[PDB]
RNA sequence: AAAUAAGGCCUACUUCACAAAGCGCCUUCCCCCGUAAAUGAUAUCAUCUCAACUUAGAUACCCACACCCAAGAACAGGGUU
RNA sequence: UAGGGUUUACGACCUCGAUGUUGGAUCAGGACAUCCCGAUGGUGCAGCCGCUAUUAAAGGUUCGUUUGUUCAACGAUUAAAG
């Protein structure tokens, strides 16, 4: 549930960490823009 | 100049700075004690 | 993301607009902000060459809140060209007189002091009232949050949390006030 | 607090009670904000805790009725005075532009005309020096002259 | 006048903060209307 | 400017209010300016013992109570209605 | 209330009723019409004109607005600073009875320009005596301002171009006025050389 | 959301060394590597924050404990 | 009513003439911070505020070839019915 | 105890392969430790004539006889000849 930042652009944030705890690994997906977050072509 | 001065010399960079750091530190009381806690016999008797 | 070469250069090195406000709130941390973001500074290739920069649009400079004693204090001073006339017009005076002086000036010694300054002046504008023309109105894109946080009066804190205070002391019941 | 009726009558009645928290926090102390452990966590920004202490119409308290200490007291005067400055009290009056954190009068103050070379600059005065001992919250120290 | 240390000569005297300044006003004696 | 009736008596709430208020400006010291006064009181039982009835030559009938008023306010009201 | 634009004819005397001399001008309001109206600048303005010039030596752009209205192209146009209140309709014409007697108006115009003059005639300098003992300084300015200081004080006191501007006068009371020949005689001197126009 | 001093020195407190070229070619060409740079970092400080508060005991930081090496 | 400094003029007076100049004539308008006063507390007296609030407390000129000129060294400007 | 470098010096630090030396003429820029026009407190203030302390420099600051001398004496002015 923490959280460090807001993942609400760009992408989400998960730091992960390996067993030996040598190496450290992320997923950052890419977050997508919502239908309801746009606005109708003027013409 | 001369050693003594009718004036205050100015004193060295480093003079001023070991003056500056060696100044005089009060405790710091954590709690401070301002927030913590004859003739009458005569006239008595009278 | 792809991007072909001539569009992802125009949209990576294009100008966008941003929005500020006062009413409250101190003159020195807003002019800060308009020339960090005029400057480009806030983007990550900030560049005096590259000439990145963001108009910077600010609000309501009518309601200035200065700290201290500055409205007493601070002499916006400027001498003419012609003899004896050594203006020093406090910032009082020059606020009632001119309330769109203030900020300009502070934004105007923020920047750096080379040619583009002007330019960066000239991106920016000013407006002392809500009124806003439309054209900057529908350029204007997000707000960056304010400065300072509005000290509030004791006329929005709500009942309910004036009866969560609890009191501190116990006047005698026969106190005159 | 009672009031002095008038009408010649002139009659007297007493009305608001204290009624103050059941269990404080810190007892066995001297003034109410070492009861309450406030003497270094407030501002004047929170007006709640100034209203406890301040006239119907904008004056102030006694000490000996009120109890707080003398630098207490006079931390909570200045206050006071910041908040009226800052119109954060508009229900308090006696019967244009903006300001807070101030500790002069607007119709004292001179225009500085003249300032000293940075070895002698006439900084000006922001805050109050009797705040010096709240949290700072942070690293730099209360620059209370600018 | 420009008297820094404000005496009291008279009893009828008080000091009084006012326009910056202290001063010393009296109105059996204002032989005493001193300045800073 | 006339006669006025201040009373006071262990009965109700004892409150020095009343007692400062005669042992006061009503000494020898005032009472110069009027000479044909004669501030009297008296100790009936009653209650709200305060009843200073200050009766002004213009016919104003002035009264002063009482059992939550202190003496320092009771003395400046009636100095400033002495004065007009 | 709108003004006119007369020209400056001449001088002439005028005696009042105790006894002594009083100079006054001559105004001459020729056609005086107006040539459109403006709203909110600051305040309402209208445009005025006076003589009639030949409409052949004038731009294309001022000869088509001439020609939009009636009346030939004017020489002049003042703009004046007037209310929301009084506002008349273009075209129409502004004679002499605008201005009644008893009356101070104000009148501004260009000035006898002596060209790029000396010292002396351009601000009044005492120059320098004939003898004991100059030799080439009987006009010149001497020292300028100071000696450490390198510069020149802007609007200092030099050779100029004297004249040739625009100047107003405040306080100048009328004491006759011609309806027939559309004349307004004003109180002391006017601005500016003979047939010269004048607001 | 974050500072220069705090960020860099979160990411010296985790055995990631790396020169300020690569970090600013990393936020200009790849906005997410600095995002989630910028989280490690902001994680490490809430760390080190809370074993300044608690001393641990003994969590000692999920992301802290350095490699030792020999 | 007179002068001071500034803005204009030759119709009366002069140097003088197809002009210009003064000795000759017209005009010149906004408060300035230094004080004295209601109402009350720290300091329930009293008290002008480096506490809250009230008293003596911008108007003006402007922004459509070629001949003569009161416009001008040229340039530029005004008129050429 | 604080401010002055305007008088007399004191030191010779670039300026003796050059900075032309005082008054007096036109022009004055600035500072107030302010002579006068504006406003106050006191006074050995019954009023003017006076004295003192604060602000205000937007303005004014004469005509002449002598000695080469700014300075130096004298006659008459205006509120003042700083
Ligand atoms: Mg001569
Ligand atoms: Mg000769
Ligand atoms: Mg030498
Ligand atoms: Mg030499
Ligand atoms: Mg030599
Ligand atoms: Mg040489
Ligand atoms: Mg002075
Ligand atoms: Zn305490
Ligand atoms: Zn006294």
């Not at chain 3, 993301?1 to 500020?20: H, V």
């Not at chain 3, 304010?146 to 004791?154: A, Y």
């Not at chain 7, 009148?107 to 601000?123: C, D, E, L, S, Y």
Request: net charge positive.
């Amino acid at each position: 549930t923490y959280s460090p930042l807001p993942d609400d652009y760009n992408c989400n944030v998960e730091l992960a960490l390996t067993s030996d705890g040598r190496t450290i690994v992320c997923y950052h997906p890419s977050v997508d823009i919502p239908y309801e977050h746009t606005k109708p072509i003027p013409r | 100049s001369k050693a003594v001065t009718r004036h205050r010399r100015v004193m060295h960079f480093q003079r001023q700075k070991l003056m500056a750091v060696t100044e005089y530190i009060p405790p710091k009381p954590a709690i401070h004690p301002s927030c913590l806690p004859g003739l009458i016999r005569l006239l008595r008797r009278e | 993301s792809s991007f072909s070469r001539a569009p992802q250069q125009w949209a990576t090195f294009a100008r966008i607009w941003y929005l500020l406000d006062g009413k409250m709130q101190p003159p020195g941390k807003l002019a800060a902000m308009a020339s960090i973001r005029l400057q480009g500074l806030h983007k990550p290739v900030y560049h005096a060459l590259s000439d990145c920069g963001d108009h910077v649009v600010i609000m309501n400079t009518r309601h200035i809140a200065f700290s201290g004693n500055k409205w007493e204090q601070k002499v916006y001073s400027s001498h003419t060209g012609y003899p004896g006339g050594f203006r020093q017009v406090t910032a009082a005076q020059l606020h009632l007189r001119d309330p769109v002086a203030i900020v300009k000036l502070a934004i105007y010694g923020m920047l750096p002091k080379n040619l583009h300054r002007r330019t960066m002046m000239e991106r920016l504008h000013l407006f002392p009232d809500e009124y806003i023309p439309e054209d900057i109105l529908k350029n204007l894109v997000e707000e960056l949050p304010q400065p300072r946080k509005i000290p509030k009066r004791l006329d929005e804190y709500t009942q309910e949390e004036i009866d969560a205070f609890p009191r501190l002391w116990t006047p005698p019941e026969d106190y005159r006030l | 607090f009672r009031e002095v009726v008038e009408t010649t009558i002139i009659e007297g009645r007493i009305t608001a009670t204290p009624k103050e928290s059941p269990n404080p926090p810190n007892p066995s102390g001297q003034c109410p904000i070492c009861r309450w452990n406030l003497k270094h966590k407030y501002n004047y920004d929170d007006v709640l805790l100034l209203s406890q202490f301040i006239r119907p119409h904008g004056g102030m308290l006694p000490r000996k009725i009120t109890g707080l200490c003398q630098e207490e007291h006079r931390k909570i005067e200045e206050c006071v005075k910041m908040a009226h400055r800052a119109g954060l009290l508009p229900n308090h009056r006696p019967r244009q532009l903006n300001r807070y954190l101030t500790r002069w009068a607007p119709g004292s103050v001179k225009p500085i005309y003249k300032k000293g070379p940075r070895w002698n600059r006439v900084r000006m005065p922001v805050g109050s020096p009797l705040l010096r001992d709240n949290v700072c919250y942070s690293r730099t120290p209360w620059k209370l002259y600018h | 006048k420009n008297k820094t240390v404000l005496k009291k000569r008279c009893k009828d005297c008080y000091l009084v903060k006012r326009r910056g300044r202290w001063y010393v006003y009296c109105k059996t004696h204002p032989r005493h209307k001193q300045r800073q | 400017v006339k006669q006025v009736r201040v009373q006071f008596c262990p009965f109700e709430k004892n409150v020095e209010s009343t007692r400062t208020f005669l042992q006061t400006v009503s000494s020898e010291k005032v009472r110069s300016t009027n000479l044909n006064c004669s501030v009297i009181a008296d100790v009936r039982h009653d209650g709200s013992e305060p009843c200073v009835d200050v009766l002004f030559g213009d016919g104003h009938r002035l009264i002063m109570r009482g059992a939550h008023l202190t003496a320092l306010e009771m003395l400046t009201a009636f100095a400033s209605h002495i004065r007009a | 209330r709108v003004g006119l634009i007369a020209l400056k004819l001449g001088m002439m005397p005028l005696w009042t009723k105790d006894g002594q001399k009083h100079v006054v001008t001559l105004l001459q309001v020729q056609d005086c019409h107006v040539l459109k109206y403006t709203s909110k600048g600051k305040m309402a303005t209208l445009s005025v004109g006076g003589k009639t010039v030949s409409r052949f030596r004038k731009a294309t752009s001022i000869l088509e607005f001439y020609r939009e209205l009636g009346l030939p192209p004017k020489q002049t146009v003042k703009i004046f600073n007037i209310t929301d209140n009084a506002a008349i309709k273009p075209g129409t014409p502004l004679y002499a009875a605008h201005f009644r007697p008893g009356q101070y108006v104000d009148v501004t115009a260009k000035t006898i320009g002596k060209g790029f003059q000396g010292v002396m005639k351009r601000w009044g300098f005492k120059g320098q005596p004939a003898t004991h003992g100059q030799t080439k300084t009987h006009r010149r300015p001497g020292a300028v301002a100071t000696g450490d200081i390198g510069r020149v004080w802007p609007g200092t006191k030099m050779p100029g171009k004297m004249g040739n501007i625009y100047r107003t006068e405040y306080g100048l009371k009328v004491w006759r006025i011609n309806t027939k020949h559309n004349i307004i005689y004003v109180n002391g001197s006017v601005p500016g050389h003979k047939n010269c126009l004048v607001k | 959301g974050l500072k220069y001093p705090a960020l860099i020195g979160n990411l010296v407190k985790c055995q990631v060394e790396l020169n300020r070229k690569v970090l600013a070619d990393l936020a200009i060409y790849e906005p997410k590597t600095f995002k989630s740079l910028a989280a490690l970092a902001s994680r490490r400080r809430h760390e080190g924050f809370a074993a300044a508060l608690g001393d641990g005991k003994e969590p000692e930081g999920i992301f802290s404990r350095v490699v030792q090496y020999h």
